[model samples]
Target: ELNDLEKKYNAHIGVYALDTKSGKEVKFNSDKRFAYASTSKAINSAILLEQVPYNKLNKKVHINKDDIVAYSPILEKYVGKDITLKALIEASMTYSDNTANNKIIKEIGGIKKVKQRLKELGDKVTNPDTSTPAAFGKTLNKLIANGKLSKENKKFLLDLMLNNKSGDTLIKDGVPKDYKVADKSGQAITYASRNDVAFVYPKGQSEPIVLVIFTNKDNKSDKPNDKLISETAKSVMKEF
Candidate 1:
């Protein structure tokens, strides 16, 4: 399955998928570290939701204009109204909105809390500065398989993940439209690293397939990177 990747890019690449029910797998370089990019939003949401109540996710949270750090699309799109943690996570995960990401990290006790939560989950995460596809997969496994997040909460978060408006060129676009795909993609305008992690539910299938695909650095063209992710998804679906 990984043969084509050898001729593609020199950058470190990670691809991993797990069958939530069968415990079967397909992987390549999944243990290696990558830049992580906006994929961190999944961790941030996990940490925040674990601390805050589900009811409050929709309640308004204060965001002073001064708190508006760079890269925040929420700052410009939401106008002057107060924002909720719900919108923040939705925008952060779906759009990879930086403004929402900044507010989320602060509310969840910063990068410090993100690491704390990672350790608690037994992932033994690293750097507090970055993460790995394996670590992200571990957390998602807990949320999806281990009953950490309630069904309602998981549904809400996964629904947002599937609603990705920013990454039409990635996971959602790659898979068959009839299949319900919930995923999170991470990248930035100038960053060489690019990634997308997803839980795929095939038609008439009873199990969810968790996939984590990462490119440590873009090979000067997004075309190959995009094809790599899409093709990987297609192949995984075929095998399962």
Candidate 2:
């Protein structure tokens, strides 16, 4: 199935999917590295929620005009205004706002702290710039049920990802409507990359199926091949 996908898209692709209830897995090129892009926002946000109390979500952080960077759809509207930490997470995770992501990174004491947290988890493969599908799969597992985050905190993060508009056309498109899905997608010109990671909830089931897909176009097109991701997702869904 995966070999056909790579040939059809003319891209390098990786997948790591697991059913939490059954421990059933479907994987292909799951260990190869790919640029994580904005998907890292999910990891960064997890670190912030872990270190900070939920009561402090209303705490406002000042956003300077200088703090604005490229692709800040949400943050660009509030330059020079004070935005709540909750809003920042919404902008970064749901909207994939670059400036909001930088602010979250600063709020969490910079990239070094995030790297250290990953190191503490014994993850040496997922650096700041890149990660494998399996590494992302492992990270999501830890975040969901590893006792590091409160149930409320976990729901908060998942809810944000569920509402993410950037990926509505990617992995989410391939999923059956009856199941609940919360996913994050990332793309960049460097690899002409498209990556999506998610937790899919089956009906009447307590645990979720984790799905991770990463792809890089060899031809370096202006946009990532969105269909390849959706098709890969459909194929994996057949496993369950």
Candidate 3:
């Protein structure tokens, strides 16, 4: 019955749930590979945790103005020149804040060190960035001079996109409002890619379920078909 319900919803989903206290397996997708989205933050956070002591996570540091690549409504609302790394991680996980993610991404020695750490963990999907924000900015300027974007207007547009807020509609739709879900979402219209990865605990579960779903279509808009993804996820959750 459970298998039928899952298949009916077209949920090609991967899930890992375990008894945290007993170290017993409950449900898992050990062999599946899914685009991690902001769930990669778990790995990123672990790397930072390994490097920085627990007490230092909450220590305040000056936020570099130039390091602000993407504009986020949440980041703008925070309105402080200095913030603690703990605050950044909380915002990154709880709200999936882009500015915080970018800050953490740079703070952990940028993409180079991130890739190295992932390799050490034997994960293969990680990729490193060749260009930093400053480099990307220079490329945008040259492209604008060559009439690619009319001007660098798209930078602001992209900034808004980095703070994307569609998670509420997809992986989060079925979960109770009271339950805490730490997750990340990513979408690319050019490639019609949509991904949601979450660590979900129902109202009282001590151990959480890790779910990752990735979908891609060769279309110009990645919006219209997301309900399918949401519905599929909802069905899977109900089954669990």
Candidate 4:
């Protein structure tokens, strides 16, 4: 089932599916080391839950105009409004809002601390940075110039992916409308890369599946790549 799906979509796929209740597991290239995309949010979630106390997570934090760096149509509606840390985290995952993500990323001791914590957890493939947003932007430009990216780029990309402003057609097209999906999608204009990482929870399931699919191709727009993502996700989702 997995092989057919992979061939159909021409996707280099990695998946980790587990039944949390029964301790059952299945994987396909699960450890092959793919870019994490928004799936890193789960890691962020783990870090936040472990580091911040319960009371602090729900405490309201003021967002100032000076703190805002990027313009996000999604976040513009909510900026400068006092919201709880819990709400920010939820918004980060639910809507893939970049502003909320950057705020939390800073609160979690910048990228350096986040990467250090992941390393301690025995995750070798994760390496977030501690640089400012401007530095991070320069690093991205370098990645595009180099053809292939360094591990840091992969880590940084995943962190930024938590605020996906586009690229939804491929990752979410296949799931049942009622089935829940927690995912992040990303795109780059230069390389036309489309990437996604998701946790899919089917109806009545106690645990979810983790899937990562990344594509880099020379194309003008995301339409074709987006279709590839959607078709691939649907095929893979049918495996379980």
| Model 3 spans with C-alpha error above 4 angstroms | 1-37, 74-80, 94-96, 128-166, 175-181, 187-193, 202-205, 222-226
For 45-65, candidate 2 gives per-residue lDDT tens digits of: 888999877777999999888
Q: Rank the candidates by TM-score, best first.
A: 2, 1, 4, 3
The collision pairs in model 2 are none
Segments of candidate 4 deviating more than 4 angstroms = 1-42, 53-55, 74-82, 129-168, 176-179, 187-193, 219-221
The C-alpha RMSD of each candidate to the native structure, in angstroms, is 2.7, 1.9, 13.4, 10.4
Alpha-carbon local distance difference test for all models: 0.71, 0.83, 0.50, 0.53
36 in model 1: Cα distance from truth in Å? 1.9
Positional deviation of 73 in candidate 4, in angstroms?
3.7
* lDDT, model 2, position 187: 51
lDDT at residue 222 of model 3 (Cα atoms)? 36
- Tens digits of per-residue lDDT, candidate 4, 149-195, equal 34443343344343444555656666778666555554332344456
Model 4, C-alpha of 26: deviation from truth (Å) = 6.3
Q: How accurate is candidate 4 locally (lDDT)?
A: 0.53
Count of steric clashes across candidates, in order: 1, 0, 0, 2
Model 4: weakest 10-residue lDDT segment is: 129-138
Clash number for candidate 3: 0
What is the Cα-based lDDT of residue 194 in candidate 3? 60
As a whole number from 0 to 100, the lDDT of residue 152 in candidate 4 is: 42
Measured by TM-score, the strongest candidate is 2
User: Candidate 4, residue 10: CA error in Å?
Assistant: 7.1
